[PDB]
């Protein structure tokens, strides 16, 4: 599965980069680590 | 280390709005999410608020969280106070090393009975205990409301701040509060003063009882 | 639902070592961050440690770093806390808790029932029981002082349980000696004295001690 690095934008949407920045709905990604206020964290897609 | 400081106690009447603050001692409150937990008597904590102001499903809308950057603080507001809201509340965040940290906690009282001043009974050391070469003065404090008191011991007129142990007020069967305090002495200490006093302060008023070695 | 049941812990001496275990029911353990939180009697929650679902990342409170080690075994839905170099200030109820994906691993939604850990140099010892003799409302107070026992708990009843009105048994104090004391009081009618007898029944199971003490007015 590809890992995303996502953060709050400048439903809920996250600003994510792959592996160049795309906006994903929070419902379509799954945190891989604690989500952070004002910081990025890693996610995977809900399909994978 | 960082401290998240909360008021020790908050009180309100049913239907009122109460607020519980959480002040971060160092760094910025906005560096990390603030969470709030409720711990009712004898039960495990549950989430009230996470991610600063989000409520899990099932948490009533009368709970809300906010952040105030200018005071480096977070706040939990409870509107329409209900009896079941009587609980301890803890904020929670994390520090510069990414360790989680709880606030000191706040005991929330929902005021629901008449104000009652404490009844104080001071027991001198028993004959049996003195024959065992020990001496304990026992100050029992009962039937008061709200459930907060401070206790002060005196030998004659002078404060005694050694050998004192005091319990936190707990509920009686009749739903009033009680507390106890102990002054441990030597038999010679006991016999060498004209009197001892337990002084109990409740809501600004002081109740005093005195015993004297000359039974 | 997910339920967390702690086991292990118990009593140990300063410098000793204990292991806590937590068994999780349900289906989410392999994706959950798992935490330990402790709470001393009458004190606030203190966060201890957490471990990622894949065991690759762990964190520890400054107060326990270097002395505690958190670990997990996902195939058995079990969380561990290895507690070495124990200190008296580690005495507390320890809770297993889950930080699940739905919170973003940010909050503890499910908590265990807790397991007590007591760190003390004191040896098992039964209490001495002393009477607290009674002196408008026609109301007097009498009681029993239960001094210098270890470990907790002690139980007190009055007149073998027949007397319950006005009865209050206080929580224990922990003295510098390392030993506990408590008292039990009962408020009675001033008229009952002389005709009615009052006995406090004290039980300290850890020491196999049972004491019945008659509390008589004094003079
Ligand atoms: C998302 O992040 C990229 C990189 O910082 C930035 O160029 C873009 O404007 C951002 N968009 C939003 C909506 O935050
Ligand atoms: C983000 O992470 C950095 C480094 O981990 C930390 O210093 C900071 O407080 C965090 N929060 C914000 C808002 O940057």
Author numbering:
A (entry chain J): 126 to 135, 152 to 160, 172 to 186, 186A, 186B, 186C, 186D, 187 to 196
B (entry chain L): 1 to 9, 11 to 27, 27A, 27B, 28 to 66, 66A, 66B, 67 to 95, ...
C (entry chain H): 1 to 52, 52A, 53 to 82, 82A, 82B, 82C, 83 to 100, 100A, ...
Task: Quote the authors verbatim.
Structural characterization using negative-stain EM and X-ray crystallography identified the variable region 2 (V2) of the 16055 NFL trimer to be the common epitope for these antibodies. The crystal structures revealed that the V2 segment adopts a β-hairpin motif identical to that observed in the 16055 NFL crystal structure.
Crystals of D15.SD7, D19.PA8 and VD20.5A4 with the scaffolded 16055 V1V2-1FD6 were obtained and diffracted X-rays to resolution of 2.8 Å, 2.0 Å, and 2.8 Å, respectively. The V1V2 structure adopts the same conformation as seen in the 16055 NFL trimer (RMSD of 0.9 Å, 0.6 Å, and 0.8 Å over 44, 39, and 41 Cα atoms, respectively), confirming that these antibodies recognize an epitope elicited by the trimer and that likely no induced-fit conformational changes were induced by the antibodies binding to the scaffolded V1V2 compared to the trimer. Our structural analysis indicated that there are two copies in the asymmetric unit of D15.SD7/1FD6-V1V2 and D19.PA8/1FD6-V1V2 structures. We also observed additional interactions of all the mAbs with Val182, Pro183, Leu184, Gly186D, and Asn187, with the light chains of D15.SD7 and D19.PA8 showing some contacts with the proximal N-acetylglucosamine (NAG) at residue Asn187. D15.SD7 and D19.PA8 form 10 and 7 HBs with their epitope, all of which interact with the hypervariable V2 region. Our analysis suggests that D11A.B5, D15.SD7 and D19.PA8 mAbs approaches the V2 region with a similar angle (122–126°) from the side (lateral) while VD20.5A4 approaches the 16055 NFL trimer slightly from above (~114°) and rotated compared to the other mAbs. While all mAbs approach their epitope with the same angle as seen from a top view, D19.PA8 is tilted 5° from the others.
